[PDB]
Ligand binder design. Structure first.
Ligand code: CA
Ligand code: CA
Ligand code: CA
Ligand code: CA
Lengths: 51, 274
């Protein structure tokens, strides 16, 4: 996932969940990319949809 | 042909529209990813952008257009139907095409909306921390007579943990949670003391770029039903203060369960507009 335009603190509140490689559900891609940045890029996408 | 999304009858907006009150002469700003103003089922009469390189009247994400359609999709022979289809609709772009943004962009949008005389602000967006300037901006908007509505958050529940984000968590903002068409809380809907009211947020059908329609989930979808409801109330009772509109919405809501999970419950704009 291209998370190059992150971090950004505010995200839409559309629920379109992504499941991270950490088995956490992120509410949408914006939430996921913020988490990727927080992890210094270790977090990857396991799959679209909730874990 | 026009279809009526389920949220309109569920919050009883159809009853108020049938009385002849549809949000005419009420200004609503949708602070979001923009609105596709050229969509046949929307009438965007102004706005501004606080995202560099993007115009107020385009929407490269789709979210802002969907939110706007729940507030204000035109009553005509096509598409869908908004809660308050006669409102004066303004696009205030504070999030980019990726659906993300800075607190400063949001603050600039809230200030623009206040300065330009909006009656209602919708913010279908959130962040974990907020900012001093965001608190100031919503407090200023509300003190100067703007009804400020925001999606509560999609952080679900976990024991007694408060999962409301900002700006919903600010006391000057109405935090709106999500129910589905059975009036059941959506599992993603955030919870906590600040949760104020619920509105439809699961499987919501609305406008979407380009010139089409889509079904989305989120407290983002719930917030504009409440923003539209505030507009309906003001179109029927134009001299009410923002606090009076807010109180009407919460005090006439249909109880659904513990306020931690549901706030005062599902809005009922027919009762709220009495
Ligand atoms: Ca148009
Ligand atoms: Ca229509
Ligand atoms: Ca609040
Ligand atoms: Ca509550």
């Amino acid at each position: 996932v291209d998370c190059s335009e992150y971090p950004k603190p505010a995200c839409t509140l559309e629920y379109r969940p992504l499941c991270g490689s950490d088995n956490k559900t992120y509410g949408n891609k914006c939430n996921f990319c913020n988490a990727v940045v927080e992890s210094n890029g270790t977090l990857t996408l396991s799959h679209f949809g909730k874990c | 042909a026009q279809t009526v999304p389920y949220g309109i009858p569920l919050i009883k907006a159809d009853k108020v529209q049938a009385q002849g009150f549809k949000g005419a002469n009420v200004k609503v700003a949708v602070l979001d990813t923009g609105i596709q103003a050229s969509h046949p089922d929307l009438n965007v009469v102004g706005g501004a952008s606080f995202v560099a390189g993007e115009a107020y009247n385009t929407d490269g994400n789709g979210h802002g257009t969907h939110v706007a359609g729940t507030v204000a999709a035109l009553d005509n022979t096509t598409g869908v139907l908004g809660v308050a289809p006669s409102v004066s609709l303004y696009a205030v772009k504070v999030l980019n095409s990726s659906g993300s943004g800075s607190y400063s962009g949001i603050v600039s949008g809230i200030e623009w909306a206040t300065t330009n005389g909006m009656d209602v602000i919708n913010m279908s967006l959130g962040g974990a921390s907020g900012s001093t300037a965001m608190k100031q901006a919503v407090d200023n908007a509300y003190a100067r007579g703007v009804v400020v509505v925001a999606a509560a958050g999609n952080s679900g529940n976990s024991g007694s943990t408060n999962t409301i984000g900002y700006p919903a968590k600010y006391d000057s903002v109405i935090a709106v949670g999500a129910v589905d068409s059975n009036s059941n809380r959506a599992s993603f809907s955030s919870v906590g003391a600040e949760l104020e009211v619920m509105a439809p947020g699961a499987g919501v059908y609305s406008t979407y770029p380009t010139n089409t329609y889509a079904t989305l989930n989120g407290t983002s979808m719930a917030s504009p039903h409440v923003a539209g409801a505030a507009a309906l109330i003001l179109s029927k009772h134009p001299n009410l203060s923002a606090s009076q509109v807010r109180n009407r919405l919460s005090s006439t809501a249909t109880y659904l369960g513990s306020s931690f999970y549901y706030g005062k419950g599902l809005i009922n704009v027919e009762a709220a507009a009495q």
